[PDB]
Every structure is written in C-alpha cells, then in structure tokens.
Amino acid sequence: AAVIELGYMGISVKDPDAWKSFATDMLGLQVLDEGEKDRFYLRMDYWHHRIVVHHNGQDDLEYLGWRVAGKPEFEALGQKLIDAGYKIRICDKVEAQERMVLGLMKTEDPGGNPTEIFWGPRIDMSNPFHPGRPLHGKFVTGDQGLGHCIVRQTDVAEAHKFYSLLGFRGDVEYRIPLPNGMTAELSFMHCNARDHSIAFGAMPAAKRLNHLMLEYTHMEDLGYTHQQFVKNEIDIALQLGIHANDKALTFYGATPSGWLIEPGWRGATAIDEAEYYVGDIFGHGVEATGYGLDVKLS
Amino acid sequence: AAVIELGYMGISVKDPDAWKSFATDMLGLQVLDEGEKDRFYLRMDYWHHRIVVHHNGQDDLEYLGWRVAGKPEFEALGQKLIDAGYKIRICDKVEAQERMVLGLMKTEDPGGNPTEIFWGPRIDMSNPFHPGRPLHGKFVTGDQGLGHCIVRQTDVAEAHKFYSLLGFRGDVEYRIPLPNGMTAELSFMHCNARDHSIAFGAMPAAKRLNHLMLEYTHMEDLGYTHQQFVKNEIDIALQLGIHANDKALTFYGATPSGWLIEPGWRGATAIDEAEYYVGDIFGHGVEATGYGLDVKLS
Amino acid sequence: AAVIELGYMGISVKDPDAWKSFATDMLGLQVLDEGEKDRFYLRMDYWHHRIVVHHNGQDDLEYLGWRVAGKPEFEALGQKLIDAGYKIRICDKVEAQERMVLGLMKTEDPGGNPTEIFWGPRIDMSNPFHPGRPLHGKFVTGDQGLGHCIVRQTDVAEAHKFYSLLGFRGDVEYRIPLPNGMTAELSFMHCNARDHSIAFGAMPAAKRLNHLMLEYTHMEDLGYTHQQFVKNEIDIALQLGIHANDKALTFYGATPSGWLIEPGWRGATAIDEAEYYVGDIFGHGVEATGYGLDVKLS
Amino acid sequence: AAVIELGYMGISVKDPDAWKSFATDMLGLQVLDEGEKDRFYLRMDYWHHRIVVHHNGQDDLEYLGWRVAGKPEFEALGQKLIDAGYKIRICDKVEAQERMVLGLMKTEDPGGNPTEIFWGPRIDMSNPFHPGRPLHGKFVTGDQGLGHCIVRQTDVAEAHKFYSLLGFRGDVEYRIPLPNGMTAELSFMHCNARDHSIAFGAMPAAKRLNHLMLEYTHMEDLGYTHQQFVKNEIDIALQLGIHANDKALTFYGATPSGWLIEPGWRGATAIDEAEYYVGDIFGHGVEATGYGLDVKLS
Amino acid sequence: AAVIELGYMGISVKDPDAWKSFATDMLGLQVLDEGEKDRFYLRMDYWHHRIVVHHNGQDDLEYLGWRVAGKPEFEALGQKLIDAGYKIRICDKVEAQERMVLGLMKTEDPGGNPTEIFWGPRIDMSNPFHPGRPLHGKFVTGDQGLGHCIVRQTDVAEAHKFYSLLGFRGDVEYRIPLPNGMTAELSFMHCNARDHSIAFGAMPAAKRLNHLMLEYTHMEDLGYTHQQFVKNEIDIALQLGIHANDKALTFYGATPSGWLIEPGWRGATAIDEAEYYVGDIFGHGVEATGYGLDVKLS
C-alpha cells in the first residue's frame, strides 16, 4: 500500500494570460478553462487535468497530488502517517470534489511543501487530449504519472524518511564538486517506472519548486519546444544534455513564474539498485544564471 | 548490377597532425598509420579503412569510392558507362592495391568530382574497430556504407543522369525559399537503406566537398561530440536539428580543412517514393557563416 | 535454374574398418552398411546418406554430388553446360539408382574432379539420424547441404567459370602473405546460405581433396570431437580458430585417408557482396605439417 | 535484503607495470590511473572501476566487495550478521570514499578472506568503457557483477553458512574422483543470474585467491585472448573446456601474481535446483601444473 | 519448500533381458549398465538415470524418487512430515550414494508405496542421452520430471493429505460412470508444469503401479512406438486417445512386468483451478483387458 504516481499538481501564478500562451505555444499542453473565476487547468492526456493553475498567486507550487491505487491503500497510508507522528487531515466531500478525486488527505512534507494523497482521479475518456499547438506525438504519463519535481527541503534525512514512508525508494545519486572544494548531494526517489518523481538536496531555495520535468513521446516535439524557447528569447538555465541517472535528453528553461520547466525525451526505467554519479553524460551547461542551478554537470 | 554503398573516400589535407587530433578527439574515429610517408587512414568499423587522408593536400575531396557487389556488377557497370558515352579507365593491379580493393575503375562525375568504382574491399576482421576516444557506441556503417556527402555540381540534370546510371534513385527533395524570392533546389540520391549517400544542387561552391555526414549508433556519442566542438570553440555552421527527409538529429561543424562535418544520429530508411519539403522539422539554424550553408531551414 | 547444395560426396578408402571407427567415434557420423561388398554409407540426417565410402580405393575424393531443385533445373543446367562447350553425360536408370537419385549427370570440373549433378535424393524419413556416438546435438545440413570442400584446381579462372555456370557466386576472399614475399589467393563460392560450399586456389596438391568441413549444431559436440582427436593422438594440421569469411569456430584434423576433416560450429550466412581478408580472426595456427595447409593465418 | 553481485575486488601486486600490460594486452581490461602513489584501477564497463590494484603487495586478494541494493538492505544485512555472531565494522565516510561507495562495512569470511559489503557504487556514465586493446565486443557484467572467484576455505560448512546468510544459494556441485580413491567436493554459490559468484572446497591453498573468472560477450575476444597467452608463452593451467554447471567455454591461465585468470564466454543462468556432476562436458585438461588445479575434469 | 518433480523411480523385474529389449526397441530409452550384478539403469536425458531396474524382482514398483530444490527444502520438508506424524528416515551417505543423490530420506505413502525424497541428482552433462533406437526427437523431462504414475491407494483422502503436504496440488478430476450405476473417482496431482505427476483412486489393485506415462517431444516417435507394439503383438489395454485433463495423445500398452506403459505426446500445462470431466476427448477404448483399466472413457 503506497504512492503510485505524481497524479496532479497545483501552482499559483500572477499572470494567467502569460501562462496560457506559455503552456500551449511553448510546451503543447492543453488549456482547459471551466469558467472558474480563480483557476484554470492544464491537460496532458485523458485525465480531466494534470495541473491546476490558480490565479492571484505567488508564482510557486501550491500542492503536489500523490496517487494511491484505491481506498484500502488510502486508509492504510493515512494510518501509517498518523502512527509515525505526522499531522494529516482527511478531507470532506467538498474538498475532495474541489480536486476532482474520490478520496483526499492533506499534509505537508518536512520542507513545508503542501502534500496531498488521493485515490480515484477523474478521467475524461470522452475528451481525448488535444494539444495547445500541433504535436508530432504526445506526453509520457500513464504508469509514470505527470512528470517529476525538485522541491525545497531543509533536512534531507527527514525528507527521505517521509517519502520512504509514502512508498518511494531512492537515495543520494549525485555528488557534485563545488568551486569551494565542497560537494552538493542530490537525492532522487521513485514510486513507479519513472526514474524519479521527487528529488531534493539541502540547498537554500527561494521557492518551494525548483523545476518540473515534462516528457514528450517524440524527440521532434522536444526539439521544436527547444526552438520555441530560443525564438521567443526565453532563458535557458541549463542547456540540452543527458543526466546520468534518468538518461533523458532534456533542457531547463524559465517559466513566467521564474521557476524552471525541464522539457525532455527518452527517460529510462527507475532502478531499485542505488548508484551515484559525479557528472552528467553530456551537456546541461549553465547558460542563464539566477535560477538555483549554477552547478557544473559536464 | 549497381552501386551498393559509399565504401571509402579520399581527402587531402594541409595539416595531418590537426586532422589526427580532430578525427580521434572530436569524432571518435580511429587513426591507422601504416608508416606511409604521404598518407594515413581513418577507420569506423572492421574495414581496413573508410577514409584515406593524403598529406600535402588541397583541404578538399580527392575521390569517392563507390562499391558494387562483385566483379560481374563491376564489369556490367563499366560497359554501361562506356555505352552511355562516359570516359572510364579500368585500373591495373598496382592501382587496385593502392586502394586495397580487388577491382578498380576511375572516372569523374559531371561536376569534376573524381569518382571510383570498385569491388572487393579489404576487411580486417582480425582488427576490431578501436575508437580514437572512449565511445558509448559505434558508427552506423554496414549495408549503409560510411555515410553521405554533398558535392559540387554545375548541372543538376547531368549529375542526376550519371548517378542514376550508377544505380542511385532520388530527385529534388528540398525547395528552400531564398531572401531574393528565389528557390534553392537540393536533390538527394540513395543506393541503399541510408536515406541518401550523395546529394547536390546548382549552388556555386568553392570546394568539391560541402560536407560529409557520419552517423553514431548512440545519441550519447553525438551529444558528447557536440560538446567537444563547443568546448574547443569549433565553428558550428548549422545548429542541432532534424532534416525532414532523413530524420536524423544532426549538426554541422567545421573541419581543419574548412569543409563541414555533419555528426548525426537516428537516420531513417531511404524511400523510393519521391517527396519534397520546404523546411526542416526543427533546428539547423545558421550560427557560423562562410561555409556555403547560409539557408533558412527552420 | 542452378545448383542448390552439396548433396552427397563419394570417397574411396584403403581401410574401411578404420574409417568406420573414425566416422562414428571421432565425428559422430552414422555408419549405414547395406551389405554391399564394395561400399558403405555415412549419414548426417534423414537422407539415406551424405557420403558414400568405396572400398579398395585411393584414399581420395571419388565424386561430388551437386543438387538442383528438380528435373526442369536439371535439364536446363545440362543444356547450359553443353552450350558452353563442357562434356557431360546424362546417366541411365541403373546409374541413377546407384546414387539413389531420380536424375543424374556426370562430368568433370576444370581440375579433373569428377562432378555429378542430380535431382531427387532419397530421404529416409522413416529412419531418423542416429549418431555413431552420443551427441549433444546434430549436424547443420538442410538448405546448406552436407558441408564444404576445398578441391584441387590447376586454373582458378577456369574453375570459377565452371562453378559460376552451375549457379555459384564468389571470388578471391583471402590474400595470404607467404614467406617468399608472394601471396596465396583462395577463392570461395556459395550456392546457398552456407558461407561456401566449394573453395580453391592454384596450389599444387597431391590429392583431389584438401579438406571436407562438417558442421555441428552444438559447440559441445565440436569440443568433444576436438578432445577425441587429442586423446587418440590424431594429427591436427591447423589448431582451433575462426576464419574471417565464414566465422565458424573450426579445427583441421587428419583422416585415415590423409586428407583433412574440418569439424566446426557456428558458420555465418553466405554474402553476395565480395570482401577479402589477409588473415583469420584468431587461431588456426599450424601444428602438424605435411598436409597442404602450411600457411600463416594468425 | 541480500547481496546482489560481486561489485568490486581489491588485489595487491609486486609488479604494477607487468599487471598493467597484462590487463590491457592479454585481457582487454582498461587501466585507469588516478595518479595515486600506491594504486591503480581496472575498468570493465561504466563503473568507475571493478578492480583495485594496490602496489607493494602480496600477489594475492586484498578484498571482495559485495553489493546490496541500497541502504535498507545494507542496514538489515549488518544486523543479520551481528545477530548471528559475526564480527562486522560499519565504516566511516573516509573509508567509504576510499572504495568510492555510499555505505561500507568490513568483515572477514570464515576462511579469513577480507569481505566488504557496500551500497551505492560510483558509475561514470560520462566515461564509457574503453578497452586496453581493440575488442570485438565487451564484458558481461550488469546484473551478474564483475565475474566469479574461487577463494580458500578451511571449513566448507562454515563458509556455506556465512554466504547463505549474505543471500547466496548453492551447494556441492562437483564430486571429482582423485587418484587416491578419494573425492574432491566443490561448492558453488550464486547471488544473481551469474551461474556462480563464489565457489570453494576444503583444499589446502597457498593463496586466498585460486582464480578469478572474467566473461567476454564475444567468442572472438575469448579466442584472441587465448592466442595472446599462447604467443606470450603464458602458462595455461587448464586448457579450453566447458564446465558442466556454468556451461561457459573457458581456459585458465597464469597472472603475474601466480594465481589464475579464467577468461570465458557464454555462461548459463544460475539455477536454484541443486545438481551435481562428476566431470566437465569436455576439455579443461591439465597443462601447466603448480597452480592448485591438478584435478581430472575430462 | 516442496517437491518439484518425479526425479527417478525404481522398479524390480523378473526378466532383465526382456526389459532391456523392451526399453530400447519398443520405447527408445537408453540402457546404461554399470556392471552391477543386481541392477541396470534407464536414461531419458542428461541425468545419470531416470529409472533403476533391479533384478530378481517382483515385477512392480520399488520406489518413487521425488526431488526438492536443495538441502533447505529437504530439511524443511522432513520436519513438516515429522510434525504431521509421518514416519521418515534420513539416510546415511552410503544409502544416498546408492541413489546417486546428495541428500536422501525414505518413507512410505498412505498406500504403502515406498517413497523417497531427495535433493542433488547426478547429471552426466558429459554423456548426452543416446536413445536405444533411432528417434526423431527426444523425451519431455526438464522442469516436468520423468513422467507420471498412477499408484495404488487404499484411502484417497489420506493419499491426498500426504501428497498435499509434499507440495502437490489437485483433486478429483474424473467421475466415470460404471456399468453398475456407480461412479469411479480419480484424483490427479501436480507439482510442476506436467499436468499431473501422481494420480490415484480407491480401486483394488494387484500391484503398487498401475501405469507409468513417458512423453515424447515428437508425434513421429509416439506413432512409431505405437507401430512397434502392434508389430510385436504387445497388448494394448487402452487404444490411442486424448485425456480431457492433460490433453496428451496417448495409448497404454503392456510391459514385460504386466503393469502398463503409457507412451504419449503433447501434454498440456498443469492448472491450479480444479475442473472435472466425465469422459475423454476421444479414443482410449478398451482393447486388451486384465490390466485394471476396464473403464469406459469415450
């Protein structure tokens, strides 16, 4: 009984109009606006939505929504969290319906990141994904969930304890030499075939969210997205490259919210056997600075 | 009875030392030096060599070596060329041994590019390919030959006539809008599964050779090669991108000889059904100029 | 309309008893003795036989039996041979029944090797192969015929002309440096998926037959056969090794007749694209001399 | 929670220069020298290293490094060892960094063989394996670890108890008749798909290490390695052959340290169903003596 | 921890000479005679033997040998039997060596059938199976063990209890209408992929053994065996047919011992979901009577 994917996430923004154009044109996400005054939705697949975009916001993460298989796993995981001393709240029907899920609980991770556990997402099988721009392919979701995030943590061991309790596996996978003779350690945790769904280190961070990674089925879509960022003169924090752990081809670019999007292609299957690396396979060179990723990876 | 691959090529250079370091470090080719005063060899696979590098040169193409299956196809193709009015010379044993082939004929294509037809290459099965730097993978050769070239032509129809006679198929595949309201037409011809092995247009060219394309089995090797060009501050004429015909991910970078190398990955199978395009899938943006590829492809 | 396999061969021996023990114990062939005063048979598969062993012999080849698909190909190939000036004889029923074939013609190759062309071999489907010793596996026959032979030739070009007319393809595949500064050229020809079925050079030879190659399905059988030759102190002319053309693991050992047997495993598919080599992949070192294979291959 | 592969090993040598030439030329291993005064590394794959070669040594094993999946399995296995009465030491960070692992513990097996248990090896994905000589293929590592060793034991039952506790399975697989009417019993244990990773008997042994087996992906590399040993007149203790348990084609040759290397090809998958044999499939005949393997296997 | 196959069986006979000719000629088994005064062996595969044939016998079963995976399963199953009140004896080394196994225990089933449990059979990988007559194929053994037996039982529920404890699964699969208005119930139990390895009912039986089933890989071998029984005028108790449970094509014929052999082909995989039938798919008509199988199956 455990978390099985990153199901949805909630973000808040100061400029919904910018975000709509960004999501559709720069990424190929689908905008779904249900006429609600304070929010709209982004789709990737048959799910009613993967991302909720709240208005009047802080340009940061609002919540991560972690899926469990069904009510039995929901109830068991709640009691597990309670038993280990974590503070959780089981939500009422109104709150569950807000997220469009059958069961919902709210807590916060050890870093203060608002964390939701749910079962029973709404799937709109009648409404196939229709991307915000023409795409050669689609997104990799399914058993691997929407993507992955790096979020702020103040205590890596406590964060690891919490995510392990949720059913994640993983540990330190990068030891990065720093220009001070020190080492930066990044830990990466998986809960399904996606090489990682959550990752973190002890680094001071101005925002809850460092970056969100979204994966294309097709290299042609990743390339065109890269071209869109360049044509539109959008900051690329780390250039195209291949991480040693997940082995995806990715780059990192600015969002209208100032945290990074990592569009990518060809992520490898998660492994339970822990390894570490001291650098990337190639690329991911620093280009734009001021984003929390001034580290040497190749 | 026809040409079946680009088997070898000969180039001449002014700086053999630069070329050795370039081939090994920037590309991962193997240098084989047989102690000959005026030449060395580059390997890609079990062939004794794919490229002959002659010293004291012109920094351009010396010859293209087109393979036929055996002596019967050799003899039939010679008589075909003679019958259609082309000037060929069947080489003696000494000349054949120079190229390390069992049978050899020399002619020139309609653009003045020295052209060789041969059967029976020397394979050193005892000496497996050992790349000039560590590689994740290897090169795509085999049935597809060493790679592809764009070479100078003065008359596209005459060039097409000549290569069709050799057993190639293909025609105009790109019509590129030019800043003058004119169109540039590029023709691409295949003789095996490699999407193309020879290509050309009517464009004035300072050299016989515009570019040579070499294909990696592994994207990781292409990325690292791209990183090598950037770290070494080598001119990139056209940035990373995907052509609409061959669908390979490639970039074009300078050689010590001033003509371009196109390192690449994931070329599609040649098709006999002619199509045309007016642009690339993404990328291949102009970066360095002065190389004969100032055209808008995306 | 062409030759499709080496179907059977006839040999003559001075010591049938030695040959029986040799075939069964050292090789795992099946001895079938039909009570004929002057001959016995060796089986490899469901064929009534692959090898006829005649008594009172010369310890050399008596005939090679080349199969065509049926009577139409038989009649067409006969007329082809006649038309090109070769002397053939179409055999009567008694002669055909001697070889246990439906149609039979006799001629000699340009080297004086008695050569038979036939259609319609006798298959004893009721009598499955039962090897002369326990085997892990069986023999590779089927579409590839019984194996391959190197036979004496006095004129390589004439031999090539003759076998090409029979439907074989191939040419010079080895150029072997000799301790005299000279080169030995060996030509290898295929008529099916077996990398070669006949091979030859211009070398003076005391016998029609240099060696016969037989292929095991299982490496374990080849190893045990190698062990049998060693335990029985049988001459090994060339030690274990891998030829660059066929890529089989083989060794060459003496027969009671003084010509060599080449037991082997893992032969590659024949290719129509001619290549040449100047040495083997590894091994095939000279051990026993006096056998016509004192050449340096690794 | 258990050992999952032989991850690394440490050896000490009197002649590092000999070992470098041996590793590269005779075996095709990669030498990696990090400029440390007292040691260098041998690579087989993307791991930073598989073998540590310490200078100023005893020409024997220094340690075997057994990998577990992650920290949870590490902690559970430590407590398991403690609970069963074994003496272990959990290493500090400096000691862990020495081995380039995330967690490290040291103990000794019942035979006095220094034994390490670790999680989190360093993988240099940026630095693909580059063999010390040209290779047709590569090494079999991955889920099967670096290879297998036979090490000295004084009490087979105690050794079995210890390795079973570490998660290995296996028992007596060979009962070898001895020229004294006695029987030699060898036990073989697996911890993954490699047929065995550790093996032993009660035999008096002058060294900790009897032999190390390394596996090639390609038979052509094994043959060429065999040829290298012969050309360089290196002692072969047991000739080419196929063991009945693992079914690999192997030979055993001397190292500069006097213990044996067993280069091999085509190892079968480990089975949990115990069988025994009284001899090999073929070969492995004694050639050079004085190495602890004077036993009759075929 | 459980029984995993019928590994060997022991029978005793009054006429060893008849049995040798029967095994080889009528069935294609291999006779292996180790020069022991009182016994010989029958082989089916790489096992030293599957059947021990004791002389001076009773023309009935002597023992069934049930394999477990290794010593741990051996020790656990012994204690399980003891704990449930069964009488077992763990054998000494001399007794274990008699059966050529690493560990051995003896007991009797609830019907008085001597029952052995063992681990570690002797495999003669060096001595491939060599059938007693030419065969098109071989036997189905491997994970499915040697075959299956129906043995006498006096209490079906007690027999079921005992075999369930050994790790078998299965129950009543046939309810056969009898000419008395009664029903015969036969129970069939599996311990691997073989549809059943042991089967029984409450029927009075003059012998321990009703029949032994042996399976050919090839239908051609089953047909030829059927032809051998007919040509030699050997009693066929039940004619060719297909049972509804195992779905093999089989017949039942007399042995020199008077109990039946069931040669067969194409047995289906065992299923854990219990079904029953009231008749066969076709055939298995009574021919010879006096054998304990006078029941109507089609």
Ligand SMILES: Oc1cccc(-c2ccccc2)c1O
């Ligand atoms: O420990 C784990 C915890 C959660 C999920 C996985 C997983 C990994 C790959 C594919 C499917 C599931 C896992 O290994």
Ligand SMILES: Oc1cccc(-c2ccccc2)c1O
């Ligand atoms: O998906 C990923 C895989 C490996 C490393 C990172 C990473 C890069 C820079 C800073 C923090 C993490 C990552 O995002």
Ligand SMILES: Oc1cccc(-c2ccccc2)c1O
């Ligand atoms: O503030 C911003 C920061 C980064 C990107 C955009 C953007 C939005 C839509 C389309 C293109 C770029 C933006 O507005």
Ligand SMILES: Oc1cccc(-c2ccccc2)c1O
């Ligand atoms: O017209 C043609 C001429 C020469 C080669 C090909 C070919 C294309 C793809 C794969 C193999 C051969 C071809 O189509």
Ligand SMILES: Oc1cccc(-c2ccccc2)c1O
């Ligand atoms: O391989 C290729 C595929 C498609 C186009 C080109 C090309 C690009 C620029 C100028 C000329 C040709 C090419 O090289």
Ligand SMILES: Oc1cccc(-c2ccccc2)c1O
């Ligand atoms: O003139 C030149 C032009 C382009 C590249 C190189 C180069 C050669 C070796 C290594 C790196 C770059 C060079 O010398």
Ligand SMILES: Oc1cccc(-c2ccccc2)c1O
């Ligand atoms: O030219 C040829 C003549 C005769 C047979 C083949 C052949 C080769 C491989 C597989 C099947 C037939 C062939 O190529």
Ligand SMILES: Oc1cccc(-c2ccccc2)c1O
């Ligand atoms: O099958 C074969 C493949 C390649 C070469 C030979 C050969 C070796 C020595 C002398 C003549 C031929 C051969 O038999």
Ligand SMILES: Oc1cccc(-c2ccccc2)c1O
């Ligand atoms: O003259 C001979 C030459 C070579 C081998 C044998 C031989 C025959 C049977 C069994 C073993 C060896 C032989 O007799």
Ligand SMILES: Oc1cccc(-c2ccccc2)c1O
């Ligand atoms: O008992 C065992 C203990 C450890 C590993 C294996 C294993 C065997 C084959 C393939 C994968 C794992 C095993 O069976």
Ligand SMILES: Oc1cccc(-c2ccccc2)c1O
């Ligand atoms: O890998 C192996 C498999 C089977 C036996 C041995 C062995 C041979 C001689 C002495 C000790 C063990 C071995 O190494």
Ligand SMILES: Oc1cccc(-c2ccccc2)c1O
């Ligand atoms: O003492 C030694 C024992 C065995 C082999 C070597 C050796 C080392 C390098 C290259 C070839 C052989 C050696 O030096």
Ligand SMILES: Oc1cccc(-c2ccccc2)c1O
């Ligand atoms: O309950 C069972 C007990 C023993 C074996 C099996 C089994 C059946 C089919 C294939 C493999 C094992 C089984 O199902």
Ligand SMILES: Oc1cccc(-c2ccccc2)c1O
């Ligand atoms: O394998 C088998 C499958 C189904 C039934 C029987 C059987 C037939 C007659 C009497 C007793 C059992 C059998 O042997």
Ligand SMILES: Oc1cccc(-c2ccccc2)c1O
């Ligand atoms: O008593 C007997 C009963 C049944 C069969 C045989 C027999 C033995 C060998 C060959 C053929 C039949 C026999 O002897």
Ligand SMILES: [Fe+2]
């Ligand atoms: Fe990421």
